[PDB]
């Protein structure tokens, strides 16, 4: 019963400047947890589908960085402890999205980025030739 009668809407103003165009948006998420990456992939794909963005998903081969340390404090050289770090990847390639759509979608998924998951978003922007390169001089 105690529902808000009216709700204030955020102000989104249509600017008079043309909008950027993104041919590709490759969001490569790196983590240590394949399950976390899979859950984030599900979330991002569902959000993109809801927003109408075309999305494909790839799994770049993981990386395992290993190194060795002396197990004992003082002399037992032959005995070592080997540690490793696993970086698992998930690449979400979004295609044919405008600047505003890319901004909103990226803000969403980045704010919701899990702890321990880093992101590298490569944006391939579409441009026209500058007027100063149209004609020979």
């Amino acid at each position: 019963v105690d529902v808000p009668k009216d709700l204030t809407k955020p102000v989104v103003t249509i600017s008079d400047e043309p909008d950027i165009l993104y041919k590709r948006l490759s969001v490569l998420v790196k983590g240590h947890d394949k399950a976390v990456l899979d859950s984030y992939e599900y979330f991002a794909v569902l959000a993109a589908k809801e927003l109408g963005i075309s999305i494909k998903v790839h799994e770049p081969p993981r990386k395992i960085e290993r190194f060795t340390l002396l197990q004992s404090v003082h002399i037992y050289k032959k005995h070592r402890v080997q540690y490793e770090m696993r970086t698992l990847y998930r690449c979400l390639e979004l295609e044919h999205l405008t600047g505003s759509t890319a901004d909103v979608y990226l803000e969403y998924i980045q704010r919701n980025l899990p702890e321990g998951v880093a992101m590298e978003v490569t944006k391939t922007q579409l441009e026209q030739l500058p007027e100063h390169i149209k004609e020979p001089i």
Partner: protein, 101 residues
């Protein structure tokens, strides 16, 4: 309040090296080319030698930031092997796990 006097000395060396980095860079640039006159290069050599010893970056020793260990230090985490093993074994270093393959 550093771990020991060796760590304190290294901290002072790092501070002085940072302070004198630019001057050393310029003078070494003067010295490290065959273009300028060798007399000018020699005066540059005597200047760079006259700079204080602790400003030399080579004197900086990479020590563990928690036990001042001068060797067995992983540059990435700046922790000696012992401290790094302690943290990793207790599971307080993200993503680091025992290697088995």
């Amino acid at each position: 309040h550093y771990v020991d006097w060796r760590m304190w000395r290294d901290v002072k060396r790092r501070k002085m090296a940072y302070e004198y980095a630019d001057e050393r860079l310029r003078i070494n640039s003067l010295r490290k080319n065959t273009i300028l006159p060798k007399i000018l290069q020699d005066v540059a050599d005597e200047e760079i030698a006259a700079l204080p010893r602790d400003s030399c970056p080579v004197r900086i020793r990479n020590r563990c930031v928690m036990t001042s260990r001068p060797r067995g230090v992983k540059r990435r985490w700046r922790l000696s092997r012992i401290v790094f093993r302690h943290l990793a074994d207790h599971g307080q270093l993200s993503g680091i796990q025992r290697a088995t393959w």
